[PDB]
Design a protein around this ligand. Structure first.
Ligand SMILES: COc1ccccc1C(=O)Nc1cc2c(cc1N1CCCCC1)n(C)c(=O)n2C
Length: 109
């Protein structure tokens, strides 16, 4: 049901954000500091934006939620060179966030 699902997602988002130990993915990539970001990235995403989306009832299924998480990672791997803190952090988040989502999905099913 909807209310239990939304409770699950809120907890899941909290746990995903907990894996961002560099605090690298918790606000939008700042265009004032990374001015060419939108030359390469179609749809920016970050955990604050996901929280706004969650609280506005925009994630009513697990796939839509997981897709936005996957964008946080994919965008970062795409934009940044391999030998950067950003790329390395995204690879780690993919692994550790992946684990959180697998557990959450087992709960939702
Ligand atoms: C607020 O961010 C900055 C402030 C001053 C100088 C530089 C930055 C900055 O480069 N931030 C930044 C760049 C990112 C980035 C994240 C950030 N910040 C780092 C500081 C906290 C907010 C997010 N991700 C995920 C990327 O792929 N890129 C290129």
């Amino acid at each position: 049901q909807l209310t239990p699902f939304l409770i699950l997602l809120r907890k899941t988002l909290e746990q995903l954000q907990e894996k961002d130990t560099g605090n690298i993915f918790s606000e939008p990539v700042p265009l004032s500091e990374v001015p060419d970001y939108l030359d390469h990235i179609k749809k920016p995403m970050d955990f604050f934006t996901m929280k706004q989306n969650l609280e506005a009832y925009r994630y009513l299924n697990f796939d839509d939620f997981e897709e936005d998480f996957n964008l946080i990672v994919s965008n970062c791997l795409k934009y940044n060179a391999k030998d950067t803190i950003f790329y390395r952090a995204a690879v780690r988040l993919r692994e550790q966030g992946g684990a959180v989502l697998r557990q959450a999905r087992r709960q939702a099913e």
